[PDB]
Amino acid sequence: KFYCDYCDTYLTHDSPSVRKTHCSGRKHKENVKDYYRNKARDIINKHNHKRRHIGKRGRKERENSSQNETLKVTCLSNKEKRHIMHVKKMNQKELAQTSIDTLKLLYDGSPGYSKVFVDANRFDIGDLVKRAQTSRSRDETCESNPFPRLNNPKKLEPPKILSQWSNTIPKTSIFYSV
Amino acid sequence: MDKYTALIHDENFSTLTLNVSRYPKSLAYWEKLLNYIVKASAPICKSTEPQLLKLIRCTYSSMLNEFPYLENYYIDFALLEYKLGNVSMSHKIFQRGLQAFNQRSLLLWTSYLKFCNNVISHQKQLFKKYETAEEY
Amino acid sequence: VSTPELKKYMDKKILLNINGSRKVAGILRGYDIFLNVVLDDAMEINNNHQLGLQTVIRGNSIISLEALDAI
Amino acid sequence: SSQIIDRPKHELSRAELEELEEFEFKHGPMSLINDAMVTRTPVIISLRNNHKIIARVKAFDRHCNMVLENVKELWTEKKGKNVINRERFISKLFLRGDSVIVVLKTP
Amino acid sequence: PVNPKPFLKGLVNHRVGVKLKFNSTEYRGTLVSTDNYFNLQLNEAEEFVAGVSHGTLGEIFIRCNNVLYIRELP
Amino acid sequence: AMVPPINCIFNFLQQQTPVTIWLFEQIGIRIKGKIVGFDEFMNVVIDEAVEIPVEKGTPLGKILLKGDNITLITS
Amino acid sequence: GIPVKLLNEAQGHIVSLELTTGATYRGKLVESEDSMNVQLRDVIATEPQGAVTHMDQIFVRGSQIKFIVVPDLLKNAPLFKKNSSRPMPPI
Amino acid sequence: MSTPAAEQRKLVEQLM
Amino acid sequence: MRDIVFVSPQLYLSSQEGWKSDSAKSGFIPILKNDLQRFQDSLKHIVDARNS
Amino acid sequence: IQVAHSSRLANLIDYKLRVLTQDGRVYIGQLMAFDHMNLVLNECIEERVPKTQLDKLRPRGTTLNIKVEKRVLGLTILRGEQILSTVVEDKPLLSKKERLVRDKKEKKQAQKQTKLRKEKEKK
Amino acid sequence: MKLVNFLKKLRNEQVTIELKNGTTVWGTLQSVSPQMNAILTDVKLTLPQPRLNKLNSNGIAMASLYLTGGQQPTASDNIASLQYINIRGNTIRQIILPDSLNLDSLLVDQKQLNSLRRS
RNA sequence: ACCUUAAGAUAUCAGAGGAAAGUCCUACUGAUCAAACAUGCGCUUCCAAUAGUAGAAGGACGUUAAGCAUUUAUCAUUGAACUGUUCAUUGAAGUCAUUGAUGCAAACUCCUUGGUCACACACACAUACGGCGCGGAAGGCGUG
């Protein structure tokens, strides 16, 4: 008697494909995805800090630090800090999931494009792609699109900038572009 | 009748190879011939004909000697040689491709390092390769 | 008990390293629950001399059984 | 007779199982060690690591691991021409059964 | 088409020579009994570490894991 | 189709096809002969067994080769 | 046993395993069985003397495996917790 | 049914 | 190799000696040795134009 | 470190062991499961004495200093066939009282969650 | 008759376990698993020097002995004093029992005697 | 769509009783063992400056660093000169490295960890050293 620990459904004793059928379905394929999302989410959310050993400060150490000044502490309200934490977590997720693919768009008309960037006709990991999109075939030749500039392509996307520093940008561009 | 001899006695091979030899600087006939020779080997594996593999290697090398500035074919040839099982000649192909550009080619460096991460498995050498690549 | 999952390697060329030094390549024909394997048209890779029309390999001395085909 | 002896060990009953064990120890290859224990004659056991022991068996077991006393370990270590004969005396000794090769009974 | 178990049953009180796998050490003597794991007990057996005979042995019990082959002497 | 190794050894026994058995190394010998019978555990009896080092070996007669040493059985 | 079930849970993720001959292998783990037989895919092999090659698949007998290195995240697997609740299996 | 030896018996015995 | 030989049209048209070799050099194109005569006949009109 | 005399392999769970193999390689990681006695180690780093420095361990400066090549490898399951012997090196992070406390905590939480699961799945 | 059951009867006595490598473990013997998985506590591992000049020694044994972590840096011979080494069952070659114990009271297999009385 | 099961047992000997010989059982009784939980030992080891800018334990998959010393970089065929040596050609394999590897040693920088507790700024001790403050960690032993 063996049961899945994710689905919690008790499964009549199996060892062959019956375990390769359960583990390849959907109630055991996405329900094992939600589990490890939560466990990895925790280790991201953990905020417990190291144990604090506070030693008795001496007079020579205290007098200099008392001489200088007192420092104000910035503090927010409950709703404000809730909103700020939500925003910061969302920003961290969005930046972490970001992948730069400028080189893939730049070589869109290369003579050997379909054999490298398509990622389905590659020679290393193509063996996996080789029941379930106008895919780019390997049989493309450079005669197709002899002149790329004939209005086919579009301008490169302008570089992104941080929104919290969006007033830093110069006000007016040097040249007048229509 | 083997696959290699059946290919070499095919009539289309003569026509494609003659177009390539008559017009060395078109690259349309080059790419058509290379696509044909690769496609005529339906399975690419370690057990296919050694003569056919040598022919494919020589065709790729001749095209890369004719047109030194094709980054994508350097990468494709290195990946095919990687698929065939040996990685020393893949390293040699990538280094030859880098030398053909005088070490300044972003696509080749990116693909070379992406391949290198899986293979070298030695911290000092991998990081030295990264420092060398970033300088150029 | 449990038959090893080799139902996809049938009639496909494989290369398996006998003991720690020898390497034998052939066409797999069958297998047992001990991972005994019977492979036809063997060839001891080293020039390389063929073994025979029908050979069996005791599953004790097999280490790896990588396949030289599409799989 | 022949059927019970050839019969696979997972279908005989418990009583016939220990009867089979006793029969194996009495009429079988281990009858040699049983006799050697009973009449208290020394045995010369040749181990796997080139160690010969001379001892009297006091209890043996299915896997041929025995308890011995008055053991006298005799072995030689050599390299090239040079050879040295070393011997060690042990009062009471347990011996695992996976090492033994041939067990000779004293005439 | 004789199987090894009936073969070893038939070799009882027959001059057999069993050789270990280590140093071509060969024991020649009459077979007294066998176990289901092919443990062998030899009587009045003579030891052949090589083609040279070393001596005569009283009665030897031979562990099952060492024998390479059991052959019937003429 | 699939033929198990037990069935292959059975075919060897039935057709009396001579086999050359590879005993594993550090022993450095081969056995050539005909299979007369096999067992559960790949124990084989061999008729007209021929001893060959790794070709000046001596015939052995009829032998029972323990299966814990066999590595290949090729014809 | 727990380790066999852990290796079972480690399916579909890149594991690295070293055999008793000295070689090393790493790649996607397609299937594993209760006797530690594993099938690696897109494996990158390191033969004992240092040479590195590549094969599509491999099927190594479990009697030769020395150890198997699974991804670190599997430490939080549900079958590693000691106190567990069972659904009271039916009749 | 215990070690694979019993299963191999229940094949070899039928084979003979 | 077998049934493949390397020819170089540029070195052939330059009336040099090493226009054909079995080694894979820079600027060499594979060709069937059975068909080298037709390779020569293909460049016949251009080489005659160069000669005249 | 001192370890209780009556302490089998079941008591040494999350102890940081020192597992030795047949080929002279040691593994240093936290034990978290076992079975044939094939362990599961959390952060075990494998050590070995190179053949170039093995000669310094042979009987004869006064104090030996051996540079041991070590590899980092995580959450690895060993095989019992290769294991030779195990030694203990360090205690777990948590004290015994805190360990009992967290066990009682998780038991209470699990019992409550099981009761709620039954209550939901029935009605 | 299983001698593992007899071996389980010592349980607090000084033994001298000689592994298959060559290293001999000396120390108080705690419980023994039914697979002969000994657990010794106040151990003193040592490696016999073969006393022959040119025959050096086992090397893997030196590596294991040092990597146990208890080897004395100033020790002339290869000894490593440590506590609680757990020894896998299949590695033991022979166990030198103490001289003082009685064999007649420990070797009597109670289970076999019970079976004989029952039969 | 594939799957529906190895079987047994749960401290041990000895003594009294009940259903010739076992056989089972006893909110029966002794002795041993094991586990849990309380509870103790003048038991044993360990628990970081502030009277100061430290230190201890363990790391670094950290830098100096191309450190200082050694040592490595194919095989076959054919032609030519040569007294083995050099140059070229065909074929075969070929982990990357040579700023590497290996041997030795030192400085520096940084991470994790801890009672940074309380009372003290003290003339002790041969039976050698009040172990006669509160806790904590880990074991040893004893009792219930």
3-state secondary structure string across chain A: CEECCCCCCEECCCCCHHHHHHCCCCCCCCCCHHHHHHHHHHHHHCCCCCCCCCCCCCHHHHHHHHHHCCCCCCCCCHHHHHHHHHHHHHHHHHHHCCCCCHHHHHCCCCCCHHHCCCCCCCCCCHHHHCCCCCCCCCCCCCCCCCCCCCCCCCCCCCCCCCHHHCCCCCCCCCCCCC
| Separation in Å, CA of J60 to nearest CA in chain G | 32
Nearest beta carbon to residue C71 from set G57, G60, G61:
G57
**Do E61 and D102 count as a contact with CB atoms less than 8 A apart?**
yes
Q: Taking the CA atoms of chain D, what radius of gyration do you get in angstroms?
A: 17
Q: Percent helix, strand and coil across chain H, each rounded to 5?
A: 75, 0, 25
J50 neighbors J69 (Cβ within 8 angstroms): yes
Greatest Cα pair distance in chain J: 79
AA letter at J84? L
CA-closest candidate to residue F40, choices F68, F11, F12: F68
Q: H3 vs chain F: nearest CA distance in angstroms?
A: 12
Contact assessment for residue E39 and residue E64, using Cβ atoms and an 8 Å cutoff:
yes
**Residue I32 neighbours by CB distance under 10 Å:** 17
Owning domain of residue J79: 9-88
Judging contacts by C-beta atoms under 8 Å, the chain I residues touching residue B62 are: 6, 24, 28-30
Resolution at which this structure was determined, Å? 3.5
CA gap A167, J52 in Å, rounded: 64
DSSP bridge partners of K82: K43
Residue in the structure block whose two tokens are 């991460």: B117
The residues, any chain, with a CB within 8 Å of residue A162's CB and separated by 6 or more, are none
User: One-letter amino acid identity for J28?
Assistant: I
Residue/partner pairs of B103-108 with CB below 8 Å, 24 or more apart: B103/B136, B104/B136, B105/B71, B106/A103, B107/A103, B107/A107, B107/B71, B107/B72, B107/B75, B108/B71, B108/B74, B108/B75
User: Which is it for strands E40-48 and E59-62: parallel, antiparallel or unpaired?
Assistant: antiparallel
Kind of pairing, strands E59-62 and E55-56? Answer: unpaired
The helix/strand/coil state of G14 is strand
Q: What's the distance, Cα to Cα, between the start and end of chain C in Å?
A: 25
The answer to whether F36 touches F47, Cβ cutoff 8 Å, is yes
| Distance in angstroms: CA J60, C1' L105 | 22
Q: Could you tell me if B38 and A123 are in contact, meaning their C-beta atoms sit under 8 angstroms apart? A: no
Pick the CATH number of C1-70 from 3.40.50.1100, 2.30.30.100, 3.10.310.30, 2.40.10.340: 2.30.30.100
Size of interface B-G (CB pairs under 8 A): 17
d(CA B54, CA B60): 10
Per the CB < 8 A criterion, the answer to whether E33 and E12 are in contact is: yes
Which run of H or E residues covers position B126? helix B123-135
The CATH number of F2-75, from 3.40.50.720, 2.60.120.620, 2.30.30.100, 3.10.180.10, is 2.30.30.100
Contact between the CB of B9 and strand L at under 7 Å: no
Chains that touch K (3 or more CB pairs under 8 A): D, J
Q: How far is CA A66 from the centre of its chain?
A: 46
Tell me which amino acid residue A108 is: D
In H, minimum Cα distance to C1 occurs at H4
DSSP designation for K106: T
Rg (CA), chain B: 17
Residue I29 DSSP class: E
Q: How far is CA A75 from CA A81, A91, A166, E59, in A?
A: 9, 21, 25, 95
Q: What is the DSSP letter of G82?
A: S
Other C-beta atoms lying within 10 Å of the C-beta of residue A11 = 15
CA F33 to chain centre: 7
Q: Which nucleotides of L are covered by protein (CB under 7 A)?
A: 1-6, 12-13, 22-23, 34-35, 37, 48-53, 60-62, 89-97, 99-105, 112-118, 136-141
- Check if residue J67 sits with its Cβ under 7 angstroms from strand L: yes
Pair of tokens at residue K92: 């033991």
Cβ separation G7–J106 shorter than 8 A: no
Pairing of strands I29-31, G52-60: unpaired
Contact K32, K8 (CB under 8 A): yes
Q: Do C62 and G61 touch (CB under 8 A)?
A: yes
J62 touches strand L (CB under 7 A): no
Are the C-beta atoms of G71 and G13 separated by less than 8 Å? yes
Residue J31: burial class (beta carbons within 10 Å; 0-12, 13-18, 19+): buried
Let me know how many helices (H) and strands (E) chain B has, helices first. Answer: 8, 0
Q: How far apart are CA F70 and CA C62, in angstroms?
A: 12
Secondary structure element (H or E) that encloses residue J90, with its range: strand J83-90
By the 8 A CB rule, do F43 and F68 touch?
no
Distance between CA atoms of residues D55 and D104, nearest Å: 11
Whether residue F75 contacts residue F19, with contact meaning beta carbons closer than 8 Å, is answered with yes
G22 φ/ψ sector (left φ>0, alpha ψ -120 to 50, else beta): left
Q: Are F23 and F70 in contact (CB under 8 A)?
A: yes
Q: How many residues does chain G have?
A: 91
Both tokens of K100, joined, read 């003082």
The third-level CATH classification (topology) of the domain covering G1-79 is SH3 type barrels. (2.30.30)
Q: Does G57 touch chain A (CB under 8 A)?
A: no
Q: Would the CB atoms of B79 and A103 count as touching at under 8 Å? A: no
B66 closest CB neighbour out of I2, I4, I27: I27
CA atoms within 13 A on the CB side of B102: 0
Which residue among J33, J73, J75 sits closest to G2, beta carbon to beta carbon? Answer: J33
d(CA B114, CA B118): 7
A125 neighbourhood in chain G, CB within 8 Å:
42
Using the CA of I23, give the nucleotide whose C1' is nearest.
L90
> Is C26 in contact with C38 (CB distance < 8 Å)?
no
* All residues at 6 or more sequence positions from K82 whose CB lies less than 8 Å from its CB, including other chains: J87, K43, K45, K68, K69, K70
Query: What's the CA gap between E71 and E18, in Å, rounded?
Result: 6
Residue D18: C-alpha distances to residues D22, D34, D101, K6, K119 (Å): 6, 17, 26, 19, 10
Cα distance from F73 to chain H (closest Cα, Å)? 18
**Measured distance CA(D73)–CA(D56) in Å, rounded:** 13
Report how far apart, in Å, the C-alpha atoms of F44 and of each of B56, F13, G1 are.
Answer: 49, 10, 36
Nearest CA in chain E to D35: E59
- Closest amino acid to nucleotide L91 (CA–C1'): I1
Residues 6+ apart with CB under 8 A from A2: A11, A13, A14, A19
Which of K93, K30, G65, K21 minimizes the C-alpha distance to J80?
A: G65
J51 touches strand L (CB under 7 A): no
Protein D10 CA to nucleic acid L66 C1', in Å? 71
Contact by Cβ (8 Å): G56, G40: no
Residue E20: which of E70, E73, E72 has the closest Cα?
E70
C-alpha of J95 from chain center: 17
| Distance of alpha carbon J78 from alpha carbon B24, whole angstroms | 59
Let me know: does G59 contact C10? Beta carbons within 8 Å: no
**B88, G47 Cβ separation under 8 angstroms:** no
Distance separating alpha carbons of residues D97 and D64, to the nearest angstrom? 5
With tokens 């296919």, the residue in question is: B48
Give me K84's structure tokens: 């609680």
Report the amino acid identity of residue G21: T
3-state DSSP assignment of residue G17: strand
Put simply, the answer to whether K6 touches D59 (Cβ < 8 Å) is yes
Supply the DSSP symbol for F72: E
Question: Cβ of J8 < 7 Å from strand L?
Answer: no
Walk across the sheet containing G65-69 and list its strands. G52-60, G38-46, G24-32, G14-19, G65-69, J76-78, J40-41, J31-33
* CB contacts, 8 Å: C35 with chain G: 37, 61
A12 CB contact with strand L at below 7 Å: yes
Select from C58, C60, C61, C62 the residue whose CB has the most chain F CBs within 10 Å, as the one to mutate to test that interface: C58
J110 near J68, Cβ under 8 Å? no
Q: Do chains G and A touch (3 or more CB pairs under 8 A)?
A: yes
CB atoms within 10 A of CB D70: 15
Q: Considering only CA atoms, name the residue closest to the C1' of nucleotide L115.
A: A53
Nearest to G57 among C2, C63, C66 (CB): C66
* Domain range list for chain C: 1-70
Q: So where are chain E's domains?
A: 1-72
Q: Which nucleotide is nearest to H2 (CA to C1')?
A: L6
B29 to each of B20, B118, E5, how far by Cα in Å? 5, 35, 72
**Is B120 within 7 A of strand L by CB distance?**
yes
Distance K11 CA to L36 C1' (A): 22
Tell me which chain H residues have a C-beta less than 8 angstroms from the C-beta of F41.
Answer: 5
Distance from CA of C48 to the nearest CA of B (A): 15
> How far is the first Cα of chain G from the last one, in angstroms, to the nearest whole number?
25
Rounded distance between C-alpha atoms, residue C15 and residue C27, angstroms: 9
- SS3 category, G19: strand
The verdict on G47 touching C (C-beta cutoff 8 Å) is: no
Q: What is the C-alpha separation between J45 and J18, in angstroms, rounded?
A: 10
Between the CA of A21 and the C1' of L4, what is the distance in angstroms?
17
Helices (H) and strands (E) in chain K, counts: 3, 5
Distances (CA, A) of B90 to B72, B84, D35, F21, F31: 14, 10, 71, 41, 44
Q: Please, are residues J13 and J31 in contact by the beta-carbon 8 Å criterion?
A: yes
Question: For residue D33, which of K45, G22, E59, E26 has the smallest C-alpha distance?
Answer: E59
Contact B97, B74 (CB under 8 A): yes
- Position K108, amino acid: V
Q: Across-strand partners of J76?
A: G69, J41
Q: Which amino acid is at C40?
A: D
Nearest Cα of chain G lies from the Cα of A70 at a distance, in angstroms, of 45
Specify whether the CB–CB gap between F71 and F19 falls below 8 A. no
Find, among B51, B32, B31, B29, the residue nearest to B41 by Cα: B51
Q: Which chain D residue shows the shortest CA-CA distance from K19?
A: D96
Q: Which stretch of DSSP H or E encloses residue J121?
A: helix J96-122
Where do the domains of chain K lie, and which CATH numbers do they carry? 1-109 (2.30.30.100)
Compute how many other C-beta atoms are within 10 angstroms of the C-beta atom of residue A50.
5
Select from D77, G78, C70 the least CA-distant residue to A31. G78
Which residue pairs, CB below 8 angstroms and at least 24 apart, start in A10-19? Answer: A10/G86, A10/G87, A10/G89, A10/G90, A15/C2, A15/G34, A16/C2
Beta carbons of I51 and I43 less than 8 angstroms apart: no
- Distance of C1' in L41 from CA in G60, Å: 59
* Closest chain B C-alpha to C1 CA, distance in angstroms: 33
CB of J63 closer than 8 Å to CB of J44: no
DSSP code for C21 = T
Backbone angles phi, psi at K95, to 5 degrees: -115, 115
Q: Which residues in C lie closer than 8 A to residue H8 (C-beta atoms)?
A: 32-34
Determine whether the interchain pair E1/F37 forms a contact, defined as Cβ–Cβ distance below 8 Å.
Answer: yes
Half-sphere exposure of G84 (CA within 13 A, CB side): 14
B117 strand L contact, CB < 7 Å: no
Whose C1' is closest to the CA of B85: which nucleotide?
A: L95
Whether residue H8 and residue F6 make contact (CB cut-off 8 A), yes or no, is yes
User: Hey, what domains does chain D have and what are their CATH numbers?
Assistant: 7-107 (2.30.30.100)
Is the shortest CB-to-strand distance from J88 to strand L under 7 Å? no
Select the CATH number that applies to the domain covering E1-72 from these four: 1.20.1740.10, 1.10.132.20, 2.30.30.100, 3.30.70.100.
Answer: 2.30.30.100
- Asked if residue J6 keeps its beta carbon closer than 7 A to nucleic acid strand L, the reply is yes
